[PDB]
Amino acid sequence: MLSLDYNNIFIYELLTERFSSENPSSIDQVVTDFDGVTFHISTPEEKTKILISLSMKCYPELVNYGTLDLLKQIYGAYVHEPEMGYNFSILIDLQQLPATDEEKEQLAMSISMLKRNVLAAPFHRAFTKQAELADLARKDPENAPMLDKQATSQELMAIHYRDEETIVLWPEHDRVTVVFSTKFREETDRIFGKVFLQEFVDARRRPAIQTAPQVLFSYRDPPLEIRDIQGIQKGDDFGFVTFVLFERHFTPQNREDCISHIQVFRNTLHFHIKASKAYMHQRMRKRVADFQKVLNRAKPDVELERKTATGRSFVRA
Amino acid sequence: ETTALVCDNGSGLVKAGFAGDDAPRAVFPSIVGRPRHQGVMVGMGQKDSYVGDEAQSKRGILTLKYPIEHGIITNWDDMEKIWHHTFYNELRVAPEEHPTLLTEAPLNPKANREKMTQIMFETFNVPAMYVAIQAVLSLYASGRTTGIVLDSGDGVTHNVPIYEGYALPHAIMRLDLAGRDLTDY
Amino acid sequence: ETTALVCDNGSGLVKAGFAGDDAPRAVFPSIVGRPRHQGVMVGMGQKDSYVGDEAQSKRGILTLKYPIEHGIITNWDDMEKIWHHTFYNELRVAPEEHPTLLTEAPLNPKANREKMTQIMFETFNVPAMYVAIQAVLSLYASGRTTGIVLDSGDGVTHNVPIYEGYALPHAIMRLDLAGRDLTDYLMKILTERGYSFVTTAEREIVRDIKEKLCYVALDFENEMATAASSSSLEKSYELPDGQVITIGNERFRCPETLFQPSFIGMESAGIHETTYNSIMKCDIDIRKDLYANNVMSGGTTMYPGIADRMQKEITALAPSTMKIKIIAPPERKYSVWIGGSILASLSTFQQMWITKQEYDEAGPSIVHRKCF
Amino acid sequence: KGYAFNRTADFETVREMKEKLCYVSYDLELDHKLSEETTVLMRNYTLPDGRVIKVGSERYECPECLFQPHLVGSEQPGLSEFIFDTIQAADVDIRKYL
Amino acid sequence: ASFNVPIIMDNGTGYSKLGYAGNDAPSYVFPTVIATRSRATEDLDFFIGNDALKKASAGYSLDYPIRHGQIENWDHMERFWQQSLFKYLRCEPEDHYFLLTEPPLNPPENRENTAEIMFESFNCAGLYIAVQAVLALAASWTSSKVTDRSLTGTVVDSGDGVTHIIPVAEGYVIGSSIKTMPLAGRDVTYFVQSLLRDRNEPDSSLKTAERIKEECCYVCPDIVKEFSRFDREPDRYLKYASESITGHSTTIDVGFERFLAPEIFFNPEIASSDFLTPLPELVDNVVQSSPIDVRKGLYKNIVLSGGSTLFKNFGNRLQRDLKRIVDERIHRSEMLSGAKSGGVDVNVISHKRQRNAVWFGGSLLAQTPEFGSYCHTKADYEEYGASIARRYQIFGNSL
Amino acid sequence: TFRTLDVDSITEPVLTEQDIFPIRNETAEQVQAAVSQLIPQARSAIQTGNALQGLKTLLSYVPYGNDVQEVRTQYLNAFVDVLSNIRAADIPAFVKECSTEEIDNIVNFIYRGLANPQAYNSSVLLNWHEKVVEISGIGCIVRVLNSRPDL
Amino acid sequence: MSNTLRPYLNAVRSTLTASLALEEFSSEIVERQSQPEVEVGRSPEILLKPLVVSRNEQEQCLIESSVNSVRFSIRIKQVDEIERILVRKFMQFLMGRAESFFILRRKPVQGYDISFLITNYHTEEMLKHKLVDFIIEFMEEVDAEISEMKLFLNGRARLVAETYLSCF
Numbered sequence A: 001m002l003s004l005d006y007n008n009i010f011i012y013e014l015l016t017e018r019f020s021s022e023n024p025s026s027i028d029q030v031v032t033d034f035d036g037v038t039f040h041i042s043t044p045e046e047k048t049k050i051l052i053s054l055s056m057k058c059y060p061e062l063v064n065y066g067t068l069d070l071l072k073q074i075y076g077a078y079v080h081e082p083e084m085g086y087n088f089s090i091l092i093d094l095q096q097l098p099a100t101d102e103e104k105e106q107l108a109m110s111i112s113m114l115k116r117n118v119l120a121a122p123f124h125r126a127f128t129k130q131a132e133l134a135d136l137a138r139k140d141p142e143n144a145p146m147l148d149k150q151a152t153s154q155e156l157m158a159i160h161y162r163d164e165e166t167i168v169l170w171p172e173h174d175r176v177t178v179v180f181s182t183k184f185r186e187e188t189d190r191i192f193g194k195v196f197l198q199e200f201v202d203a204r205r206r207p208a209i210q211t212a213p214q215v216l217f218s219y220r221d222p223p224l225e226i227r228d229i230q231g232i233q234k235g236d237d238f239g240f241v242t243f244v245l246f247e248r249h250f251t252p253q254n255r256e257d258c259i260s261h262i263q264v265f266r267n268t269l270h271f272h273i274k275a276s277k278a279y280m281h282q283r284m285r286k287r288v289a290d291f292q293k294v295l296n297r298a299k300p301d302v303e304l305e306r307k308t309a310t311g312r313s314f315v316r317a
Numbered sequence B: 001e002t003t004a005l006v007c008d009n010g011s012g013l014v015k016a017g018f019a020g021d022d023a024p025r026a027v028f029p030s031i032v033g034r035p036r037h038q039g040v041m042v043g044m045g046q047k048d049s050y051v052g053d054e055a056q057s058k059r060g061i062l063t064l065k066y067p068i069e070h071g072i073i074t075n076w077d078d079m080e081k082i083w084h085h086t087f088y089n090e091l092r093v094a095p096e097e098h099p100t101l102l103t104e105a106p107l108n109p110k111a112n113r114e115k116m117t118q119i120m121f122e123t124f125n126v127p128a129m130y131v132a133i134q135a136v137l138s139l140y141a142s143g144r145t146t147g148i149v150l151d152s153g154d155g156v157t158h159n160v161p162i163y164e165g166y167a168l169p170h171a172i173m174r175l176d177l178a179g180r181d182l183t184d185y
Numbered sequence C: 001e002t003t004a005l006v007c008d009n010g011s012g013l014v015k016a017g018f019a020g021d022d023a024p025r026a027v028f029p030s031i032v033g034r035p036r037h038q039g040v041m042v043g044m045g046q047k048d049s050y051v052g053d054e055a056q057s058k059r060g061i062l063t064l065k066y067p068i069e070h071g072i073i074t075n076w077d078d079m080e081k082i083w084h085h086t087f088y089n090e091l092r093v094a095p096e097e098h099p100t101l102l103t104e105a106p107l108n109p110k111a112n113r114e115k116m117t118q119i120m121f122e123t124f125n126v127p128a129m130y131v132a133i134q135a136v137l138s139l140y141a142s143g144r145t146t147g148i149v150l151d152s153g154d155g156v157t158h159n160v161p162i163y164e165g166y167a168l169p170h171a172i173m174r175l176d177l178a179g180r181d182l183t184d185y186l187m188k189i190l191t192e193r194g195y196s197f198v199t200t201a202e203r204e205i206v207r208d209i210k211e212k213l214c215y216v217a218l219d220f221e222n223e224m225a226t227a228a229s230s231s232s233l234e235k236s237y238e239l240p241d242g243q244v245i246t247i248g249n250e251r252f253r254c255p256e257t258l259f260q261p262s263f264i265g266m267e268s269a270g271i272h273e274t275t276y277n278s279i280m281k282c283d284i285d286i287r288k289d290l291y292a293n294n295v296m297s298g299g300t301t302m303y304p305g306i307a308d309r310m311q312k313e314i315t316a317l318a319p320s321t322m323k324i325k326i327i328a329p330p331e332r333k334y335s336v337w338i339g340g341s342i343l344a345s346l347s348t349f350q351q352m353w354i355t356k357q358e359y360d361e362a363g364p365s366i367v368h369r370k371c372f
Numbered sequence D: 001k002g003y004a005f006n007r008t009a010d011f012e013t014v015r016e017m018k019e020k021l022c023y024v025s026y027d028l029e030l031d032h033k034l035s036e037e038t039t040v041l042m043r044n045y046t047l048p049d050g051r052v053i054k055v056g057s058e059r060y061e062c063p064e065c066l067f068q069p070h071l072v073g074s075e076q077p078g079l080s081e082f083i084f085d086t087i088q089a090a091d092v093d094i095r096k097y098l
Numbered sequence E: 001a002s003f004n005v006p007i008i009m010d011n012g013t014g015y016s017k018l019g020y021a022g023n024d025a026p027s028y029v030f031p032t033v034i035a036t037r038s039r040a041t042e043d044l045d046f047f048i049g050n051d052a053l054k055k056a057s058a059g060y061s062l063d064y065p066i067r068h069g070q071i072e073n074w075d076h077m078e079r080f081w082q083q084s085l086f087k088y089l090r091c092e093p094e095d096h097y098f099l100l101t102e103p104p105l106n107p108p109e110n111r112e113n114t115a116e117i118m119f120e121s122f123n124c125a126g127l128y129i130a131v132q133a134v135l136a137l138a139a140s141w142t143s144s145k146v147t148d149r150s151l152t153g154t155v156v157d158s159g160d161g162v163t164h165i166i167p168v169a170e171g172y173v174i175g176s177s178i179k180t181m182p183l184a185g186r187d188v189t190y191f192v193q194s195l196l197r198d199r200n201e202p203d204s205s206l207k208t209a210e211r212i213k214e215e216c217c218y219v220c221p222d223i224v225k226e227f228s229r230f231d232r233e234p235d236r237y238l239k240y241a242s243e244s245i246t247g248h249s250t251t252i253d254v255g256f257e258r259f260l261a262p263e264i265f266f267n268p269e270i271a272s273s274d275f276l277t278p279l280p281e282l283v284d285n286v287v288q289s290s291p292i293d294v295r296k297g298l299y300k301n302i303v304l305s306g307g308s309t310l311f312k313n314f315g316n317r318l319q320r321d322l323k324r325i326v327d328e329r330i331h332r333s334e335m336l337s338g339a340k341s342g343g344v345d346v347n348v349i350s351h352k353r354q355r356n357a358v359w360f361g362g363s364l365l366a367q368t369p370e371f372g373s374y375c376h377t378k379a380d381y382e383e384y385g386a387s388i389a390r391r392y393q394i395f396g397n398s399l
Numbered sequence F: 001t002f003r004t005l006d007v008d009s010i011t012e013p014v015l016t017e018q019d020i021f022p023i024r025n026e027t028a029e030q031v032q033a034a035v036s037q038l039i040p041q042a043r044s045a046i047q048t049g050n051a052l053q054g055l056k057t058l059l060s061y062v063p064y065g066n067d068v069q070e071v072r073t074q075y076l077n078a079f080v081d082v083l084s085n086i087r088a089a090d091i092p093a094f095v096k097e098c099s100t101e102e103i104d105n106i107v108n109f110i111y112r113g114l115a116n117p118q119a120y121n122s123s124v125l126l127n128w129h130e131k132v133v134e135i136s137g138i139g140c141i142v143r144v145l146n147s148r149p150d151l
Numbered sequence G: 001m002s003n004t005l006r007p008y009l010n011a012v013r014s015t016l017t018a019s020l021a022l023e024e025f026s027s028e029i030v031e032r033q034s035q036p037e038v039e040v041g042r043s044p045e046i047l048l049k050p051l052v053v054s055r056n057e058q059e060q061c062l063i064e065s066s067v068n069s070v071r072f073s074i075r076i077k078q079v080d081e082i083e084r085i086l087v088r089k090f091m092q093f094l095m096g097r098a099e100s101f102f103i104l105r106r107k108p109v110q111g112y113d114i115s116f117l118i119t120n121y122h123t124e125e126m127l128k129h130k131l132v133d134f135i136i137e138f139m140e141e142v143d144a145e146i147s148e149m150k151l152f153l154n155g156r157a158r159l160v161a162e163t164y165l166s167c168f
């Protein structure tokens, strides 16, 4: 696979099986996801009632960012009071699901896609702010730079979802710039990530893919706007990949795909580093075989009599 | 080292033998001929069908018929009988002890090859087998790597041009005129 | 250090060797080809990709792709493969023990230069490297110090006037018509006589046809009128298939694309008008010397009689009071290399390298502020 | 390794194999190092049926059960330990000649 | 501090059962097969499990990395692990502890390769290797609250590729008594396919044989009496509906296979000449070779495991045969001596988690706090090298 | 337990290197003084552009022993400098105009010089080794394989 | 490769071909047994002096000989840590299949990355005038492989970056 999936496959399959089934069964399984997020599935009250919980270390910051309302108008009346040890909880009963199959399938997909659904609140807020500044600047072109600066100052938003990762996003009259504070431990991971990040920068440059958002990466130094932001170390070992999303990159027909893509970026990079390790393994063995071919000299020709198959010559003559 | 049966079920002859032999040790016509007379004579254990050299020798009162038509198998039961004869009465080796190596003409129907491997696996319980192409094996025997190989057997005539290693699949020309048609003419 | 590496990674051909030598140790076409068939054979040493002379020899069963297009590298994988070939298979010298010299056409994107420098420094770990322009190399090779250089090659044609020790960057004219475009036009206009060339092997065959037969006339209208009475102008060529083809007015028509770019449907001045404009863009006090020193360089300028026709057109354009002289050494095919080697074998050049210790402390942008 | 000898003639076959190939170690750690880093200990043995197998550390691990009977699940002491106990249990006078 | 939940891997010959510790069921139970070709590069165009099964004729060639319990090809195994982890299991290796399992009697080289792949290609926090059995003993006891652990018995783990009879006494596994038969569900599946072959049924696909076992096969007391009963009784002649790809209502008339297939376990001569000792006799030999004091515990508790022990009347027949043999030996001793005895009873035990007893035992074991201390930490690997796990421990004594 | 704690090392004293090769009759002070007298002559010969004669003079006496480490290191440094201060074109004449024992000493010491490349120049040592093996033959390397460990 | 490694390569060739004058010899401490004497090192009277060949501080060739067995360990260049990881993994794969090589050790001596071990039997049956040929061929081809594999790493990183980024 080349592109990482955008939701939890186990939740999707479980929901599909339990919706299409006729005899439900009690289940209690806790499932982990990428980036430390953990999901818990249980049926404590009724065999036909399923409760799903979300765990995330940065969730209170999401609440500060205004994610409760987004979750509410995303998931309707399904909202349920959170369970112990978890952040967001949902309770679903199979007796009230829509009869039509496509509604059930889309509900299962939406529930399985809870990760980005809860993580996309800052992106939606940034898009709304970008629209506001766009219309305000269209009201008077001469009033752009000062409102742009005040938006870079006040609306500068940030989040820490991993302890070596950070998203810094802020809107403007025409763009929503985002900064990733990438850093890889596990030395060999950082070793391969250096090459991966270098090649990832070049990509955009090539005229072949100029339609993509502009990338900006420079290790050992952060951009001008985030040196004063708390949490950003003074370039200890952290890279900083910056994507500039213009108006065309979040057109009303392409917002969700862009959000999911920009969210999954880092996990894609990690998984593909591992895939590159496997690629080495296979090539390296594949032509150490050629070295063995080179060695197979220095063996005088000899003759084996039959050695027919799964046995020893199967005959005395 | 890892001896394997090499059965080239040609349209006119069935050349067979072990891998590595200088020349095949089993050559005989691919003919199955049943008697066509009442046969009031009793005794001597008159068989109901004769295959190969026995059929050729008794052809005076036998209805010989080839089980293959222009490289395409049309008498699957007769071909199974011929394969059984080749494995047992001529080579005297158990099929499940050595792998086999078959050949078929290019551009042949796919069902022919599928049924060939299906029979040789389900029935004779052979360990493994391969279906090569006559032109490739002719290139092997010629001790070269390039060149276009003109192959014309009893069944069909075909040319497979092969450069260094690589074989062009769009330049394979197959012509059904062959030795049987020449004999008919 | 005994000797320093130097590589002229041109668009069509690549020239490599040691500094101070007077002969290319290694010249092979800049071609990377992949197989396009099955290989029912056994063994044969199935090699995934053939590059250089091996690809040129086995083009019968390969599809060839040029990594460099119009002087800008577009397939960095193939470029790295070609550099690896030059380093290990033909010159077979360890990159880590030899400073290297590279060549890049003027006005190329800065991405090309930065990526090339970074690749050489990190993937090959060369001790030091430098990037130089073709025109400066041509002047170094010719022994001159003043004179506008016409460098026409496989990928791009550019003009860089240079006074005594100084270059005028504002008067540099770059034209994207070159040998590849000429070969494409020859392929297009050989169809009108029946012969058809499609695959990349046919493209190489047409390139050989242009090598052996194409030439530049003196007066286009008179040459066409002479070709109308097609008696003593046609020639013949032998394809590897054995078929003989006849060449006619298109023998000299396709070289005229340089002087009349409208033949391939591009609105631009010819290789003489661009030179005239480049000279006129310079200061007035140096035109009287730039006219007397017209330098021809590159593979494309090897056509018979191109120098005479270019001199005629430049003399017609320029005022008659000041003479026009054009020069083209018989070894101008490797003039860029000769200048590169002369520059690399200079004592005063030793402190103008870019060492690894200098590179890693400033990033890949150092090449922009040091090399040029 | 994967070779299976469940027939009855295979018992005599492996007896002849141990007769021809197996040997008693002189230094345990040295032979573990040899079998851990070097392939020199590998021998090729062809069965009387005609089939060849690969034998490695088995060569020095087969007769090790005599000196370390816990390998075959025996609580009794090894050969040398049992010899030492037998000699030591005797009277003090005859201990040299033992 | 508070670590993440451990992950319970399982790589069987036929099925691989991933999951988490503390769960009540494996998250994924899918076949151990990977699809592979021969503008995505050929490095990544691979599918595993049910996706590989469905995508079989679309341009991929399936291959089973594990056969007879031992891994032969390593590219397939490593690609299987990476696909599982980063596609279905959805975990970051560096922040979790793994509990791998693999059948006993494996070469130390295989364990070394597994450890080095796990700590280099992925480099997880810790890796622990357990023997397929053990976990079976752990999952044997159902109401495991504080005390009611048997901790002494025999586990007959019969699976897809190979079966293992391993005795356990007071927790520790007696190596000298370990014996293994190289016949399992796959060999009898090939036998069923051959039986379909000889009757010239319209469809003879291997999946058809698997389903024929799934809803047809059962164990019988003896073969000649069962043949006579089948001749007399005509309602034992079923016709399984196949529907292979397009052959609608191509019913397959099953026959004597329904009792001829399971009999291989109690009569291994049919499968091949590589083994000839019937399973009850082999279990008797295993128990007799054990130390004398633990024979009562070995006979009293016998635990079935694996998916190939789900045959009806399998446990009944095994218990009957073992009880008959032990009675024969005891009575022989009695008439040799001339005194009565209380005898020894045999209780072959089957439980509600027969199919995935190994996984359930692993999940129950991983939850113990002391499990973390037993894992191979990454620092130990980077210090002592890649041969940290080569000393084979459960069966046989090192040096 | 009792498996470890080997005893074979004490009951039978294995042959030790002085039992194989003849012992050095000269004293430490004598050889130290001899080398300290020979080295400055070699350095002076290098200074006056007569490196061939300097190497010939330095080759006349060669020290050895397990108690002469420091003076042997100084001798090796001087020898390496002397050899590196020789023009390459004149090597074949020098090699052909030597006795077998002198060539044996030359190849032995250049090969020991090859063992410490963090302080020496390996290129000249490799070039000399190539030329001497080409001219004299393989017997020099054979003698190197069968020379004293302290050499 | 060559045209570049003449003196070092020829020195290794000459030393190896001189050091391969092996002989059948039993064990002087264990009866009816024969072991490679270079690996045990218990009888010093039959062990020739260890010999080292080098071209630069990061390239060494330790040549330890004996009456029957010769162990020959080398170091190959690792200019940057990318090549360090590549060399380690590749040479591990190389030694992992020493069963079919007959002149390899499954684990190199400390401070090195590979150790050949030519016991007598290999010279006894396998003609040895091309064992050294394989040695030198490998010593150059290995650097060739490391360079090629780092190129392939760069290429695959470029491909995955383009594939990810193009789908915005």
Ligand SMILES: Nc1ncnc2c1ncn2[C@@H]1O[C@H](COP(=O)(O)OP(=O)(O)O)[C@@H](O)[C@H]1O
Pocket (backbone or CB within 6 Å): B009, B010, B011, B012, B013, B152, B153, B154, B155, B179, B180
């Ligand atoms: N020496 C020969 N002269 C003329 N025809 C021959 C000769 N040898 C064989 N043939 C013809 O070739 C045919 C046999 O071809 P064969 O090699 O069996 O092709 P295939 O193996 O593909 O059937 C026979 O029908 C025969 O008529």
Ligand SMILES: Nc1ncnc2c1ncn2[C@@H]1O[C@H](COP(=O)(O)OP(=O)(O)O)[C@@H](O)[C@H]1O
Pocket (backbone or CB within 6 Å): C008, C009, C010, C011, C012, C013, C014, C152, C153, C154, C155, C179, C180, C207, C210, C211, C214, C298, C299, C300, C302, C303, C336
């Ligand atoms: N004698 C010649 N006549 C006509 N065209 C030539 C001749 N020699 C070379 N060429 C053309 O010039 C090109 C050589 O390009 P080159 O000058 O090597 O490019 P670069 O200067 O970028 O290295 C070839 O592609 C060929 O088509």
Ligand SMILES: Nc1ncnc2c1ncn2[C@@H]1O[C@H](COP(=O)(O)OP(=O)(O)O)[C@@H](O)[C@H]1O
Pocket (backbone or CB within 6 Å): E011, E012, E013, E014, E015, E016, E158, E159, E160, E161, E162, E185, E186, E213, E214, E306, E307, E308, E309, E310, E311, E355
């Ligand atoms: N109900 C059943 N009855 C008999 N055999 C079964 C049944 N279900 C599965 N099997 C077979 O028994 C094997 C054992 O299952 P499992 O333990 O998951 O495999 P493995 O031994 O590869 O780990 C299955 O792979 C299958 O071939």
Ligand SMILES: [Mg+2]
Pocket (backbone or CB within 6 Å): B010, B011, B134, B151, B152, B153, B154
């Ligand atoms: Mg034929």
Ligand SMILES: [Mg+2]
Pocket (backbone or CB within 6 Å): C010, C011, C134, C153, C154, C298, C336
């Ligand atoms: Mg050029």
Ligand SMILES: [Mg+2]
Pocket (backbone or CB within 6 Å): E012, E013, E132, E158, E159, E160, E161, E162, E306
């Ligand atoms: Mg199993």
